Enzyme design. Structure first.
Site, PDB file in Angstrom:
ATOM      1  N   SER B  47       0.852  -1.222   0.000  1.00  0.00           N
ATOM      2  CA  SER B  47       0.000   0.000   0.000  1.00  0.00           C
ATOM      3  C   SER B  47       0.872   1.250   0.000  1.00  0.00           C
ATOM      4  CB  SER B  47      -1.011   0.073   1.129  1.00  0.00           C
ATOM      5  OG  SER B  47      -2.032  -0.934   0.939  1.00  0.00           O
ATOM      6  N   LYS B  50       0.721   3.475  -3.013  1.00  0.00           N
ATOM      7  CA  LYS B  50      -0.385   4.402  -3.229  1.00  0.00           C
ATOM      8  C   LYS B  50       0.128   5.836  -3.259  1.00  0.00           C
ATOM      9  CE  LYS B  50      -3.937   1.142  -1.920  1.00  0.00           C
ATOM     10  NZ  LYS B  50      -3.097  -0.038  -1.806  1.00  0.00           N
ATOM     11  N   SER B  95      -6.490   2.273   2.314  1.00  0.00           N
ATOM     12  CA  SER B  95      -5.662   1.470   1.376  1.00  0.00           C
ATOM     13  C   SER B  95      -6.578   0.672   0.450  1.00  0.00           C
ATOM     14  CB  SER B  95      -4.742   0.542   2.128  1.00  0.00           C
ATOM     15  OG  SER B  95      -3.886   1.249   2.991  1.00  0.00           O
ATOM     16  N   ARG B 227       3.706  -1.757  13.455  1.00  0.00           N
ATOM     17  CA  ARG B 227       4.349  -0.875  12.448  1.00  0.00           C
ATOM     18  C   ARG B 227       4.457   0.534  13.046  1.00  0.00           C
ATOM     19  NH1 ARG B 227       0.235  -1.957   7.584  1.00  0.00           N
ATOM     20  NH2 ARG B 227      -1.156  -1.587   9.372  1.00  0.00           N
TER      21      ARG B 227
HETATM   22  C1  ID1 Z   1      -1.811  -2.147   1.652  1.00  0.00           C
HETATM   23  O1  ID1 Z   1      -0.720  -2.498   2.029  1.00  0.00           O
HETATM   24  C2  ID1 Z   1      -3.137  -2.848   1.783  1.00  0.00           C
HETATM   25  C3  ID1 Z   1      -3.729  -2.628   3.174  1.00  0.00           C
HETATM   26  C4  ID1 Z   1      -5.157  -3.135   3.304  1.00  0.00           C
HETATM   27  O2  ID1 Z   1      -2.910  -3.240   4.146  1.00  0.00           O
HETATM   28  C5  ID1 Z   1      -2.987  -4.292   1.330  1.00  0.00           C
HETATM   29  C6  ID1 Z   1      -4.244  -4.883   0.720  1.00  0.00           C
HETATM   30  C7  ID1 Z   1      -3.632  -6.024  -0.067  1.00  0.00           C
HETATM   31  S1  ID1 Z   1      -4.655  -6.727  -1.418  1.00  0.00           S
HETATM   32  C8  ID1 Z   1      -6.028  -7.374  -0.423  1.00  0.00           C
HETATM   33  C9  ID1 Z   1      -5.572  -8.429   0.532  1.00  0.00           C
HETATM   34  N1  ID1 Z   1      -6.799  -9.044   1.084  1.00  0.00           N
HETATM   35  C10 ID1 Z   1      -7.092  -8.957   2.333  1.00  0.00           C
HETATM   36  N2  ID1 Z   1      -6.522  -8.096   3.166  1.00  0.00           N
HETATM   37  C11 ID1 Z   1      -2.308  -5.427  -0.482  1.00  0.00           C
HETATM   38  C12 ID1 Z   1      -1.336  -6.044  -1.474  1.00  0.00           C
HETATM   39  O3  ID1 Z   1      -1.624  -7.146  -1.931  1.00  0.00           O
HETATM   40  O4  ID1 Z   1      -0.278  -5.454  -1.737  1.00  0.00           O
HETATM   41  N3  ID1 Z   1      -1.995  -4.409   0.238  1.00  0.00           N
END
Ligand code: ID1
Ligand code: ID1
EC number: 3.5.2.6
Lengths: 243, 242
Positions: B47, B50, B95, B227
Site C-alpha cells: 500500500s 499508493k 488502502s 508498524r
Molecule cells: C496495503 O498495504 C493494503 C492494506 C489493506 O494493508 C494491502 C491490501 C492487499 S490486497 C487485499 C488483501 N486481502 C485482504 N486483506 C495489499 C497487497 O496485496 O499489496 N496491500
C-alpha cells in the site's frame, strides 16, 4: 430546518459560568445549528482569526513566497515567548505571531487589503484604522455565520485567490488529526476593545462529510482560554460529530 | 551520513519481531538505522505504492481532485472499509486496492513506467501489467529508497505538478497535535515471503522534519499495530516526539 436553534448547548457554557455561541454547518445536509441565533449573527473583531484571510492575501500577492519562507524576528522581546524567534507561515499561524502578520499587512497595503476583503465578502469589509492593527482595534467586524460563509468558500477553493494560496492556508490551519477526524481551525482572543471575546473558527473533516464551526464566548480574563476548544468539543460530542 | 544504531534492535526483539527503522534528520542531513543491510534491501511496496500511484493519477487528471468520488463496484471484499464510495483521502486512509487498480488502468503502462522512472522509484526492470505489477512483485523498493522518494515529495521536487504533490501530502495526513504532524502511508505485503508491514512518511516539527521508513516481518495480521508502535518507540527514544 435550514437554521435550527439548540438551547441545550447553553449547558456547556453555563457549566463554566460563561456565555457564547457555537454555530455548526453540516455541509452534506446544507443545515445549520446554533445555541443562540441572535449572537450567531453578532459581528465582533476577528482578532487572530484574521490570520486566515491575511495569510491568503499575502500568499496570492507573493508577499509570502511559500510556507517555508522565514520571517526573521525583529529582535523586540514581547510578552508571548514563542513570538521572540524566527517563524514561517506554519509556526506564525500555530503561535498567532502578531508582528509577522502586521508586516504582511504593511506590504499588502490598505488599497489591496480593502479590495481583497471585498472580493472575499469578508464580514463588514471595513479596514478602517491602522493598516497593521484594524483587525485588533479597527473597524472590521465579522459574525460567527459570516465566518462559516468565508470558511466554506476557502474549503471549496472558491475565494478569488490562487487554488495554491487556498491549499497552503488550509495546510497552515491544521490543528488536530487522528483516525476519527481532522480539524483545520484558528483561535482568537480579542482584548484591545470591549467586549473581550474568544473565537474558534474552522471545520471538522470526516470520511464523507465536513462540519464547519464558528464559536465565540465572553472572555473577561485569559484564565478560560481552553474553554474555546473544550466547549466546542463538548458540542461536537453531544451531536455525535466526534466520538 | 548513514549511522547504524544496533540499540534500536531492542524495539523489535521486545516484540519477538525483526525489521528495520530508517530515520533521516532533514536539518543535519544524517540518517540512522538499526540495520544498514536490511535498510537497503528491496521489498514489495504494497500500500506504500499508493503514494506514487496517487501522484501520477493527479498529475494526469485521472483523479480531478481529492473530492472526486470513486463509486463502490458493489462487490464485497474482506476489508469492510473498502465496501463503500471513496475519495482520494479515504482511498489512501483505508488502502482501497480496487480504486488504485482502476487509477492504474487509466494511467496505462507507458505513462506509469515513464513516471516511476522520473521518480527514480523502484527497480527499472518492471514485469506485470499496469493494474497488478505493484501487487504481485514486479516492483520493489528499500527503506532508504523510500526516504529519498519522500524527501523529493516533501520539497515538491518530483517531476509532477506542485499541486499534485500538495494534494498527496494532504492525503498522507495521519496524525497531528500541538507537538507534531505525521504524514505517512502503511503497507502490508502477504503475496510473497517474507510477509512484511511498512510505515513510511515523516514527522513535521516546528523547526525540523524527521523522515522515516520502517518494514518488519509480519507473519500474521495480529501484529499490524507494531508498524506504528515500534516507529513511535524509536521516535520517543530519540526525543523526536514526547
Ligand atoms: C496495503 O498495504 C493494503 C492494506 C489493506 O494493508 C494491502 C491490501 C492487499 S490486497 C487485499 C488483501 N486481502 C485482504 N486483506 C495489499 C497487497 O496485496 O499489496 N496491500
Ligand atoms: C489572537 O487572537 C491573539 C493576538 C491578537 O494576541 C492571540 C493571543 C492568544 S491568548 C494568550 C495570550 N496570553 C494572555 N495572557 C490567542 C489565543 O489563544 O487565541 N491568540
Amino acid at each position: 430546518k435550514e437554521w435550527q436553534e439548540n438551547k441545550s448547548w447553553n449547558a456547556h457554557f453555563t457549566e463554566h459560568k460563561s456565555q457564547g455561541v457555537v454555530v455548526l454547518w453540516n455541509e452534506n445536509k446544507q443545515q445549520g445549528f446554533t445555541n443562540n441565533l441572535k449572537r450567531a449573527n453578532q459581528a465582533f473583531l476577528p482578532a487572530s482569526t484574521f490570520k486566515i484571510p491575511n495569510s491568503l492575501i499575502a500568499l496570492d500577492l507573493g508577499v509570502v513566497k511559500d510556507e517555508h519562507q522565514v520571517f526573521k524576528w525583529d529582535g523586540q522581546t514581547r510578552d508571548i515567548a514563542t513570538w521572540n524567534r524566527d517563524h514561517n507561515l506554519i509556526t506564525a499561524m500555530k503561535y498567532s505571531v502578531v508582528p509577522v502578520y502586521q508586516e504582511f499587512a504593511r506590504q499588502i497595503g490598505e488599497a489591496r487589503m480593502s479590495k481583497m476583503l471585498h472580493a472575499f465578502d469578508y464580514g463588514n469589509e471595513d479596514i478602517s484604522g491602522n493598516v497593521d492593527s484594524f483587525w485588533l482595534d479597527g473597524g472590521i467586524r465579522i459574525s460567527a455565520t459570516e465566518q462559516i460563509s468565508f470558511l466554506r468558500k476557502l474549503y471549496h477553493n472558491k475565494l478569488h485567490v490562487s487554488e495554491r494560496s487556498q491549499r497552503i492556508v488550509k495546510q497552515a490551519m491544521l490543528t488536530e488529526a487522528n483516525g476519527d477526524y481532522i480539524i483545520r481551525a484558528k483561535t482568537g482572543y480579542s482584548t484591545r476593545i470591549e467586549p473581550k471575546i474568544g473565537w474558534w473558527v474552522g471545520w471538522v473533516e470526516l470520511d464523507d462529510n465536513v462540519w464547519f464551526f464558528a464559536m465565540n464566548m465572553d472572555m473577561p480574563t485569559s484564565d478560560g482560554l481552553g474553554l474555546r476548544q473544550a466547549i466546542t468539543k463538548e458540542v461536537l460530542k453531544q451531536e455525535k460529530i466526534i466520538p
